[PDB]
Amino acid sequence: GFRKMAFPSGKVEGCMVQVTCGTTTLNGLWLDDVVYCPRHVICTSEDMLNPNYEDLLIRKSNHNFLVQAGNVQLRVIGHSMQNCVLKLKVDTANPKTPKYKFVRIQPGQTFSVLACYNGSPSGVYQCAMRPNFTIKGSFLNGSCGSVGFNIDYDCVSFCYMHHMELPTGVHAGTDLEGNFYGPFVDRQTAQAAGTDTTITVNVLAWLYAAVINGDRWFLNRFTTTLNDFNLVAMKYNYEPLTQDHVDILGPLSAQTGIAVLDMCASLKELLQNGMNGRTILGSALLEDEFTPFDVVRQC
């Protein structure tokens, strides 16, 4: 009765196009009369190692950009670069443009990813922005320009554009202004991330979800102060819990009658002992990519 759920992707599918420079093809986002895509589309082989993007860009003309919306080519009539994103002005407005905004998400927030190849949507799944500003996605060659988003009412909030895969197999990208999340650079180099930590407010949300669906073997009669919980959390590379996090979990504490700090005491015990080979909502590991909102919406 509790599932990792992506937003319906139709409003975003109608914006995906294919963008090609030379031998490099990736995806773009077509909103009104502008197509947004990762700037490294303008790179060749030799370029990707250490590209001077302003240099590469000035040597380009509008006609070197091949933009295809399905079996239809769009004419590029202007281009500009904003940080690591290229903006291609085309002569046709996308009639399928939804109401939208560009947002920069905070670590610990979640969003849906519409993975695309050759301008064609291929799959949708939920991701969290990690505390170390990576995301644990599923992206292959040609996925760059795939976007992450949330939907509030009629409005699509774009928060992520995909650019790279790190050697550990996690992923890195930018907001739609082209600024990376995290200390990464769009060059073909092996980059390591900062130490990742676990999103504690999300683990607590998920534990509450497991209680709602009747799995409460992990609960206990003990309790803890906020600070004492945070000392243990930090020891185990969990993010500290703020009073705003406690407030945000209110609805779930109300719903289940379990005080936030009582659930913290359960989590502390799990951190110190393990799951004894047991499972919670099917998982052998503590899940930290469900926000309190994600849980509430769905229960």
First to last CA, the chain: 8
Q: Return the one option of a second copy, ligand UV2, none that residue 144 interacts with (CB less than 5 to 8 A, by type).
A: ligand UV2
> What is the distance between the alpha carbons of residues 245 and 259, in angstroms, rounded to a whole number?
13
Decide: residue 297, CB within 10 A, 0-12 exposed, 13-18 middle, 19+ buried: exposed
The residue range among 29-37, 133-141, 232-240, 291-299 that interacts with ligand UV2, by the rule CB under 6 A, is: 133-141
Q: Return the one option of a second copy, ligand UV2, none that residue 189 interacts with (CB less than 5 to 8 A, by type).
A: ligand UV2
Q: Tell me how far, at minimum, the Cβ of 239 lies from a second copy, in Å.
A: 18
> What is the distance between the alpha carbons of residues 240 and 236, in angstroms, rounded to a whole number?
10
Decide: residue 195, CB within 10 A, 0-12 exposed, 13-18 middle, 19+ buried: exposed
> What is the distance between the alpha carbons of residues 6 and 4, in angstroms, rounded to a whole number?
7
Q: Residue count of the chain, please give it.
A: 299
Residue 285 sits in the site that holds a second copy (CB under 8 A): yes
Q: Is 144 a catalytic residue?
A: yes
Residue 243: how many CB atoms within 10 A of its CB? Answer: 9
Q: Give the 3-state secondary structure of residue 273.
A: helix
* Closer residue to ligand UV2, CB minimum distance, 190 or 254: 190
* Closer residue to ligand UV2, CB minimum distance, 72 or 190: 190
Q: Tell me how far, at minimum, the Cβ of 93 lies from ligand UV2, in Å.
A: 27
Identified binder of ligand UV2 from the candidate list 29, 114, 116, 144, rule CB under 6 A: 144
Computed on alpha carbons and rounded to an integer, the radius of gyration of the chain in Å comes to 22
Q: Return the one option of ligand UV2, a second copy, none that residue 268 interacts with (CB less than 5 to 8 A, by type).
A: none
> Tokens 């009412």 appear where?
153
Considering only residues 228 through 287, tell me which ones interact with ligand UV2, judged by CB under 6 A: none
Residues that bind ligand UV2 (CB under 6 A): 26, 40, 43, 48, 139-141, 143-144, 163-167, 171, 186-190
The catalytic residues are: 40, 144
Residues that bind a second copy (CB under 8 A): 1-11, 13-14, 114-115, 121-125, 136-140, 169, 213-214, 279, 283-285, 297-298
